[PDB]
Amino acid sequence: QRERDRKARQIEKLPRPEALHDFQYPYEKTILSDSMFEYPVYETELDTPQLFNLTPPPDFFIYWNATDFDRTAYPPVPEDDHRVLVPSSQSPRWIEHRARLLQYLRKHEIMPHYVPHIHANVNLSVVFPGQYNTRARLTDENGDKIPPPPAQTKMTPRNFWFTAHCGNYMELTDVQQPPSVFFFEEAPAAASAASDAGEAGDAANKQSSHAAVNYYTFVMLSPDYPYRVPLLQDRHKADRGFFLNYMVANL
């Protein structure tokens, strides 16, 4: 009892030479996975987040030529483009696009502070006449001033990354021309089912703007006029308006 338990405590003093399959799992070995090592793939690149949240090219050989300076590294076009959606209140894509847009505004200090009560109703898409130009210039070969591109007539993949989206980036060279404004609205209907009007709505002599909300006014103002100041600095310690870039009325 006293020496057996001692021998039992000698067994615990005995060494334990136990060859292992490989190293002990938590402490020396480790488990790699695809989640640990993966390039950030934004599910939607509206905010053009690659240009801001830079991530090092993980690979060892980084191919950088000289010609990769011309290329305007805009994100790839996402299919099911928001600009062509219509802002009905039952459209499944729209509901997704309704919040994702209001998601992006809160991210960028806009929604609760600069524009307090955004009643996101219409699918605004301010296409800019764009050339994917790397800088303002003249035509190289032709020895000519570049003709200012015409007012955008249709939305298209090429005119995607030159719209006004949720915080995206545009090289100032492209915005130098007045912007084309495509907005679609759904909110006006003859009634809660467009029914029992009995040809009313027709009696409204401005059908495209028959309602008290259907002549729209597009105002563009730049909050950071001198330079982009932090919200938490400017939010409180100054009261100055915004730089009014543009304002069309009676759209």
Partner: protein, 92 residues
């Protein structure tokens, strides 16, 4: 779990607590503050039990060595965000 093992919390906002204390001690002066507050010293024993009624069982539960090391393939297939095999003890 055991009132012998204490942490030191520093909560960074000094106004966040001062501007409540000056209320909590202005309300309880007018007799309008409730004594079941979480911060009450003698209530914490019961406070946890109003919200999490079986928290004894959530820390007493002994985990089988299977679930403590969730299938490493669930980590490569990405189901589990990241396997932590050593964080096994419930410090609550």
């Amino acid at each position: 779990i055991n009132p012998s093992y204490k942490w030191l919390d520093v909560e960074p906002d000094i106004q966040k607590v001062y501007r409540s204390r000056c209320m909590r001690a202005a309300l309880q002066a007018r007799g309008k503050a409730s004594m079941m507050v979480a911060g009450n010293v003698h209530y914490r024993a019961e406070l946890d039990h109003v919200t999490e009624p079986h928290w004894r069982e959530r820390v007493m539960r002994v985990p089988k060595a299977t679930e403590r090391f969730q299938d490493p393939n669930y980590f490569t297939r990405g189901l589990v965000p990241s396997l932590r095999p050593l964080s096994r003890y419930s410090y609550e």
